Design an enzyme around this catalytic site. Structure first.
Site, PDB file in Angstrom:
ATOM      1  CG  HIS A   1     -34.238  35.732 -67.571  1.00 23.57           C
ATOM      2  ND1 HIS A   1     -33.258  34.855 -68.201  1.00 23.57           N
ATOM      3  CD2 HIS A   1     -32.550  36.491 -67.082  1.00 23.57           C
ATOM      4  CE1 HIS A   1     -32.259  35.797 -69.178  1.00 23.57           C
ATOM      5  NE2 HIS A   1     -32.052  36.779 -68.108  1.00 23.57           N
TER       6      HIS A   1
ATOM      7  N   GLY B   1     -25.816  37.776 -63.265  1.00 28.85           N
ATOM      8  CA  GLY B   1     -25.479  38.800 -63.600  1.00 28.85           C
ATOM      9  C   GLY B   1     -26.822  39.867 -63.992  1.00 28.85           C
TER      10      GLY B   1
ATOM     11  CE1 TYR C   1     -33.473  35.465 -63.355  1.00 29.39           C
ATOM     12  CE2 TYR C   1     -31.936  37.165 -63.009  1.00 29.39           C
ATOM     13  CZ  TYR C   1     -31.843  36.212 -63.250  1.00 29.39           C
ATOM     14  OH  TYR C   1     -31.056  35.398 -63.985  1.00 29.39           O
TER      15      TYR C   1
HETATM   16  C1  FAD Z   1     -21.416  28.969 -65.612  1.00 33.21           C
HETATM   17  C2  FAD Z   1     -22.207  30.556 -65.553  1.00 33.21           C
HETATM   18  C3  FAD Z   1     -23.888  30.456 -65.587  1.00 33.21           C
HETATM   19  C4  FAD Z   1     -24.650  32.176 -65.232  1.00 33.21           C
HETATM   20  N1  FAD Z   1     -25.741  31.618 -65.101  1.00 33.21           N
HETATM   21  C5  FAD Z   1     -26.634  32.784 -64.681  1.00 33.21           C
HETATM   22  C6  FAD Z   1     -27.220  32.543 -64.337  1.00 33.21           C
HETATM   23  O1  FAD Z   1     -28.472  31.788 -64.978  1.00 33.21           O
HETATM   24  N2  FAD Z   1     -28.330  34.037 -64.120  1.00 33.21           N
HETATM   25  C7  FAD Z   1     -28.097  34.558 -63.915  1.00 33.21           C
HETATM   26  O2  FAD Z   1     -27.943  36.446 -63.524  1.00 33.21           O
HETATM   27  N3  FAD Z   1     -26.598  35.157 -64.458  1.00 33.21           N
HETATM   28  C8  FAD Z   1     -25.728  33.997 -64.395  1.00 33.21           C
HETATM   29  N4  FAD Z   1     -24.582  33.979 -64.434  1.00 33.21           N
HETATM   30  C9  FAD Z   1     -23.578  35.346 -63.959  1.00 33.21           C
HETATM   31  C10 FAD Z   1     -23.423  35.232 -62.456  1.00 33.21           C
HETATM   32  O3  FAD Z   1     -24.312  35.088 -62.156  1.00 33.21           O
HETATM   33  C11 FAD Z   1     -22.596  36.476 -62.477  1.00 33.21           C
HETATM   34  O4  FAD Z   1     -21.306  36.359 -63.020  1.00 33.21           O
HETATM   35  C12 FAD Z   1     -22.149  36.354 -60.896  1.00 33.21           C
HETATM   36  O5  FAD Z   1     -23.304  36.474 -60.051  1.00 33.21           O
HETATM   37  C13 FAD Z   1     -21.535  37.116 -60.180  1.00 33.21           C
HETATM   38  O6  FAD Z   1     -20.488  37.505 -58.745  1.00 33.21           O
HETATM   39  P1  FAD Z   1     -19.072  37.501 -58.313  1.00 33.21           P
HETATM   40  O7  FAD Z   1     -18.710  37.177 -57.443  1.00 33.21           O
HETATM   41  O8  FAD Z   1     -18.407  36.273 -59.504  1.00 33.21           O
HETATM   42  O9  FAD Z   1     -18.738  39.219 -59.244  1.00 33.21           O
HETATM   43  P2  FAD Z   1     -17.561  39.881 -59.758  1.00 33.21           P
HETATM   44  O10 FAD Z   1     -17.354  39.898 -61.213  1.00 33.21           O
HETATM   45  O11 FAD Z   1     -16.419  38.760 -59.173  1.00 33.21           O
HETATM   46  O12 FAD Z   1     -17.424  41.046 -59.098  1.00 33.21           O
HETATM   47  C14 FAD Z   1     -19.092  42.124 -58.785  1.00 33.21           C
HETATM   48  C15 FAD Z   1     -17.590  43.634 -58.684  1.00 33.21           C
HETATM   49  O13 FAD Z   1     -17.471  43.470 -57.150  1.00 33.21           O
HETATM   50  C16 FAD Z   1     -16.779  44.076 -57.137  1.00 33.21           C
HETATM   51  N5  FAD Z   1     -15.990  43.491 -55.629  1.00 33.21           N
HETATM   52  C17 FAD Z   1     -15.009  42.420 -55.882  1.00 33.21           C
HETATM   53  N6  FAD Z   1     -14.623  42.138 -54.401  1.00 33.21           N
HETATM   54  C18 FAD Z   1     -14.929  43.511 -53.850  1.00 33.21           C
HETATM   55  C19 FAD Z   1     -15.196  44.142 -52.702  1.00 33.21           C
HETATM   56  N7  FAD Z   1     -14.568  44.071 -51.464  1.00 33.21           N
HETATM   57  N8  FAD Z   1     -16.550  45.573 -52.113  1.00 33.21           N
HETATM   58  C20 FAD Z   1     -16.071  45.649 -53.504  1.00 33.21           C
HETATM   59  N9  FAD Z   1     -16.246  45.610 -54.544  1.00 33.21           N
HETATM   60  C21 FAD Z   1     -16.413  44.605 -55.112  1.00 33.21           C
HETATM   61  C22 FAD Z   1     -15.359  43.234 -58.356  1.00 33.21           C
HETATM   62  O14 FAD Z   1     -14.231  43.977 -58.958  1.00 33.21           O
HETATM   63  C23 FAD Z   1     -16.547  43.827 -59.154  1.00 33.21           C
HETATM   64  O15 FAD Z   1     -16.859  44.553 -59.840  1.00 33.21           O
HETATM   65  C24 FAD Z   1     -23.700  32.691 -64.492  1.00 33.21           C
HETATM   66  C25 FAD Z   1     -22.320  32.985 -64.450  1.00 33.21           C
HETATM   67  C26 FAD Z   1     -21.554  31.892 -64.982  1.00 33.21           C
HETATM   68  C27 FAD Z   1     -20.405  31.297 -64.921  1.00 33.21           C
END
Ligand code: FAD
Ligand code: FAD
Ligand code: FAD
Ligand code: FAD
EC number: 1.6.5.2
Lengths: 271, 271, 271, 271
Positions: free
Chosen positions: D160, D148, D154
């Site tokens: 961070h 995120g 970083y």
């Molecule tokens: C419990 C928890 C703890 C976290 N702790 C941290 C932390 O310590 N540090 C930090 O930085 N983050 C943290 N996060 C955030 C987390 O790392 C991000 O939300 C995550 O990495 C996002 O990836 P995703 O696949 O979930 O993305 P998504 O949100 O599912 O996708 C991202 C984007 O890509 C698009 N996409 C999907 N498929 C495709 C495709 N085929 N082609 C093109 N685009 C596409 C989606 O539609 C969206 O626009 C945390 C999240 C949670 C839930």
């Protein structure tokens, strides 16, 4: 030495079901059987049929039909590896024991799903050769079931009704359909109310049975030779069989009761 | 307005099963019903019972017993939220439709597991009030089933044997046990061999039936008043009832056949 | 009296970890603390985040985003009850002790999952107020860790490398991120090789420390006031801080080492 | 043709994480790799270590020690079948890709638990052969991480702190400890804020990298030959190495910084 597969459907190692699996394995090994296990919960076995069962190119991904697609995968060698592993156990086994608690008058969901994912067309059944002509006709299967309810509840006069009827869709529809000879079920009623010493006796009696299991007479199902096995005939009983049976008091089995008396304990005791 | 819950057990939106779900929803809404769905595959429903169904400390983790532990969780409000959500749908619904393909002579594993995780003791049944006295006695349930096999295969003289026997463990053992009045099943045979025009007619017939579903006579099961419902009596039919029934040609039902002729279409047609 | 929460991550009541939990509870109670426990294994705790954590209507079920959806659930009161119960313990607690064996250079999976399910946005952290401005800034947290490896293995010259680096993502990234003041960790090295009399002393030393735990100086992390906390500035340290720090021999902390010498025992000892 | 295992830790098939898994699989297969998957959420993988991981008789059930007991089970062949299935994938694989979202500055709990249950002593590590002498020394591992937070957060100056420090306990403590050569991580920062065309480029760049992944130089860790690998020596760096290093400006790696400057991007770029 023959080969056995024990399929267990219970989450707890502390259960009586687990004890029965252990007893079966020990008794069969003592008599020189090779014993393989599918402890479905310990495997975290995936019980849900889906497109993910097929790893190759689908014939028609827009109108996905599991029967046709799975059969293709079976033939072309692109079933999911977890399914293939179970199919190999089945191919190897002479005897298959299913050990499970009765749940909602049937097999646990995890075992139902094992049948659904593992008993693929061509591998486990074909219409061209239903029932006694099926792929597993050289194999024997047996259900070992524990229940909460007492034996009386499942008697003819019991609140739940006849256990023979409960057993029929599993023993005929799943096991016999694929060709298995089905042995008398091991029925362990109200296991939660059985005293410790009697439970020990249940385990001993099961081991004793297993010493000679292969020689037992299997349950009676109507042979496929009684039926005209084609669509023009509607897969109906042959006219000359129907004529013969019209003078008999009892039907042939639970499902082939023919509107008459079901022979006693058709799904519980061999003739 | 009454409330309907449609439980669907099919992975494909392109399926006939899905079409029947859509048709049911449309017909019920047209008549002013509120309609809720449990599309188990679309929900990614977890069908396997486990300790994780209890969202807190177990009563006895060393000897985990799902029936007792789940009931405790139900009473204390510690069931897994996915289960609670389904229980709330059930509480709200007057009518519950189960739409599924017949799989291995029964419900799909995903639907079997829905019963196992959702029909918890106290909530869905109690020993103190089995069958017609159960919690769902003010509700009606109906099975809508599609099959690969033709109707003739499931006739009395058919290779598979009587569909009435296949339906019994589900309709009596699951639905009626919990109190439901069970309506005549919608049986759609050999849907894979039905021409396009006839499939359209099947959908129309189902919608038509649903217009007046609440007025139908339910299937006949033996009333619990015929039985002595306690352990001392073995949950057996009352002696006076047994004496009376010796003069009747037919048993009471499929499970309560009493070693006589099964009343024809007991699990398919109402009296 | 202040309020303490002890979160334990070990399956065995016979463990040294459990003994440390018992010792902590006894010492804190003796000094008039109210002590609440989260024994994660004894709680049967579910450590896996999923959509089932949210019991209300999702904003976007087709594109499920755990962070946004969980925050909404937190605000609207439809988080899973098990999570809510943990959040309430946290809200009540002044001091939070984490007692666990080091596993794969971090917290046990069951504790990692507790952070993931329980430390929901708005409740435990906000972007608008990261780190020392976070919701738990009135609270203090401490890690009490047991290891298999000796202290020397985790020294600067040890094969595993510096324990300060191992502790950083937990102490800074989890605890301090949410606002906690982090006290010096209780590090119990090679507990499997410690003689009986010395283990007794470890328990006594922990109790002794806890008598005055609230008065300790916490670990040093770079204050958020050193940074420009907005996207345009890239959440980077303020230039005047960067300029000033070029004349300091040591970096600010383990993560803010700035390509220089890490201040010794930054994550183990307070200034 | 080499063998790859992709371990995915994300619940949503709609996720970018899932897309990266699919892209990896497609690119590797195109170059003639055999590709196997462990989609931990789709498997409903059990991530919690417990006595249930050992199906045989325990050495000491009164004082259960997971390390010793699991190793015994590994050697005797009585580890839980779900664990054994993962071990077999690992044994077969030349390359292991871990695809996951960063969660609380580390791996998701479900993946942490996979390490805990699957990387059993003797199978995945032993004291007698730590790090570059470990069982997986003929294999390569790579992390593919989405975040995120932006890259700047970083950076060295970022709020961070240094991502190299975050990566160290995973890449050194989990992967390298077991012998793996660790390739440069694929770091996909602030994927929630990335424009559509750039996200397409991320997928393409990952596929491109994978075409030649086996030829990359791995990350640098201090060789075990620099240390005296026995308890008496405390697994400390050899005196002659310490003497030699004393005049060098930079330490050797993140964990072996030796109180000096960390070589830039030690856990992100090969030297
Ligand atoms: C419990 C928890 C703890 C976290 N702790 C941290 C932390 O310590 N540090 C930090 O930085 N983050 C943290 N996060 C955030 C987390 O790392 C991000 O939300 C995550 O990495 C996002 O990836 P995703 O696949 O979930 O993305 P998504 O949100 O599912 O996708 C991202 C984007 O890509 C698009 N996409 C999907 N498929 C495709 C495709 N085929 N082609 C093109 N685009 C596409 C989606 O539609 C969206 O626009 C945390 C999240 C949670 C839930
Ligand atoms: C969802 C669900 C649906 C159900 N539906 C039905 C239904 O439709 N009809 C019905 O009749 N029942 C039903 N039941 C009840 C179910 O069939 C029983 O609970 C089950 O058969 C009990 O078997 P078990 O192995 O779990 O027994 P347990 O209770 O686990 O064990 C029985 C006893 O054996 C002891 N034992 C264990 N190992 C040994 C050993 N080595 N030697 C001696 N003793 C040992 C145990 O400690 C215990 O005292 C249902 C239960 C569930 C959860
Ligand atoms: C594991 C397994 C076990 C089985 N066990 C049994 C068994 O024990 N007994 C048995 O008899 N069968 C059994 N079957 C077969 C199964 O019952 C049938 O395949 C199933 O009922 C077919 O229904 P469907 O919804 O999949 O139909 P589909 O095959 O999806 O649809 C049938 C036809 O309807 C068409 N259709 C879809 N939507 C519409 C619409 N809106 N209007 C008109 N036409 C439409 C489709 O295009 C197709 O031509 C089993 C199948 C499986 C996979
Ligand atoms: C999956 C896994 C991964 C691991 N990864 C790592 C790693 O990365 N790094 C690392 O260094 N270690 C690692 N370990 C080892 C782990 O950290 C140690 O095994 C653990 O910290 C031991 O603590 P315990 O509470 O289990 O001690 P126990 O072994 O349960 O007890 C320690 C000793 O104290 C005794 N004892 C118990 N109660 C008392 C009491 N009241 N008073 C006195 N004595 C008592 C016991 O009999 C025993 O001799 C890992 C272990 C596992 C299982």
């Amino acid at each position: 030495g023959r080969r056995a597969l024990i399929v267990l459907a219970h989450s707890e190692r502390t259960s009586f079901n687990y004890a029965m699996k252990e007893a079966a394995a020990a008794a069969l090994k003592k008599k020189g059987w090779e014993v393989v296990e599918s402890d479905l919960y310990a495997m975290n076995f995936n019980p849900i049929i889906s497109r993910k069962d097929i790893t190759g190119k689908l014939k028609d991904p827009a109108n996905f039909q599991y029967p046709a697609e799975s059969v293709l995968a079976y033939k072309e060698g692109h079933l999911s590896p977890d399914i293939v592993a179970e199919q190999k156990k089945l191919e190897a086994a002479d005897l298959v024991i299913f050990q499970f608690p009765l749940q909602w008058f049937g097999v646990p969901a995890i075992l139902k799903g094992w049948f659904e994912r593992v008993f693929i067309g061509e591998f486990a059944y074909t219409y061209a050769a239903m029932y006694d002509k099926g792929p597993f006709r050289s194999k024997k299967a047996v259900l070992s079931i524990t229940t909460g309810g007492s034996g009386s509840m499942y008697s003819l006069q019991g609140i739940h009704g006849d256990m023979n009827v409960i057993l029929w869709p599993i023993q005929s529809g799943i096991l016999h359909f694929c060709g298995f000879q089905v042995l008398e079920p091991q029925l362990t009623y109200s296991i939660g109310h059985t005293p410790a010493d009697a439970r020990i006796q249940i385990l001993e009696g099961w081991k004793k049975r297993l010493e000679n299991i292969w020689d037992e007479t299997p349950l009676y199902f109507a042979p496929s030779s009684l039926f005209d096995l084609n669509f023009q005939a509607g897969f109906l009983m042959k006219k000359e069989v129907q004529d013969e049976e019209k003078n008999k008091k009892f039907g042939l089995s639970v499902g082939h009761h023919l509107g008459k008396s079901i022979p006693t304990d058709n799904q519980i005791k061999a003739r």
